[PDB]
């Protein structure tokens, strides 16, 4: 993960406009505006605060790094949950049905009856439409 780190250093350099090794609300502003966005000073301070740990008002690399790291983990986890969902969502329409769940499960070594998969679907069917969508899937696993 020694390379991840080099890429994070480069990402950070893009924010650190003058290269002192800290990111200010001013520099963040410049970056945001170069992206077509126009956050207020209040918004810039909020964005800085979400990463600025010791609260001295700016973001150093160790804080940036610590942030990017956590962010990537959740990014990867998120993708894996979605990959799992896709496997169960046989016809890929965005909803896991009892029939698909039964089918995929058996083809994965897990044999269940219609009654059992029904109970699993129900337990996760928050919006009550009869199948498990992605959001419900996440809330359940």
Instruction: Give the residue with the Cβ less far from Ca ion, 2 or 128.
Output: 128
DSSP line for 18-77: T-SSEE-HHHHHHHHHHTT----HHHHHHHHHTT-SS-SSSEEHHHHHHHHHHHHHHHHH
Q: How far is the CB of 51 from Ca ion (least distance, A)?
A: 8
Residue 16 known to bind ligand: yes
Q: Output the CA torsion 60→66→71→73 (10° steps).
A: 160
Instruction: Give the residue with the Cβ less far from Ca ion, 4 or 56.
Output: 56
Residue 74 known to bind ligand: no
Instruction: Give the residue with the Cβ less far from Ca ion, 10 or 18.
Output: 18
φ, ψ for residue 135, nearest 5 deg = -60, -45
Q: Is 117 exposed, middle or buried (0-12, 13-18, 19+ CB in 10 A)?
A: buried
Q: How far is the CB of 27 from Ca ion (least distance, A)?
A: 5
Tokens of 91: 């016809």
φ, ψ for residue 95, nearest 5 deg = -130, 135
Instruction: Give the residue with the Cβ less far from Ca ion, 30 or 75.
Output: 30
DSSP state of 127: T
Q: How far is the CB of 56 from Ca ion (least distance, A)?
A: 5
List interacting residues with Ca ion (CB under 5 A).
Answer: 16, 18, 20, 22, 52, 54, 56, 89, 91, 93, 95, 125, 127, 129
User: Annotated binding residues, as ranges?
Assistant: 16, 18, 20, 22, 27, 52, 54, 56, 58, 63, 89, 91, 93, 100, 125, 127, 129, 131, 136
User: Annotated binding residues for Ca(2+), as ranges?
Assistant: 16, 18, 20, 22, 27, 52, 54, 56, 58, 63, 89, 91, 93, 100, 125, 127, 129, 131, 136
């Amino acid at each position: 993960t020694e390379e991840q780190i080099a890429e994070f250093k480069e990402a950070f350099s893009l924010f650190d406009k003058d290269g002192d090794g800290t990111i200010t609300t001013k520099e963040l502003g410049t970056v945001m505006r170069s992206l077509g966005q126009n956050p207020t000073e209040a918004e810039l301070q909020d964005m800085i605060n979400e990463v600025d740990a010791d609260g001295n008002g700016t973001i150093d690399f160790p804080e940036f790094l610590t942030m990017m790291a956590r962010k990537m983990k959740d990014t990867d986890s998120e993708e894996e949950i979605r990959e799992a969902f896709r496997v169960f969502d046989k016809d890929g329409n965005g909803f896991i049905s009892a029939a698909e769940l039964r089918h995929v499960m058996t083809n994965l070594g897990e044999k269940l009856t219609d009654e059992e998969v029904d109970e699993m679907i129900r337990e996760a069917d928050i919006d009550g439409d009869g199948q498990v969508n992605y959001e419900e899937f996440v809330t359940m696993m």
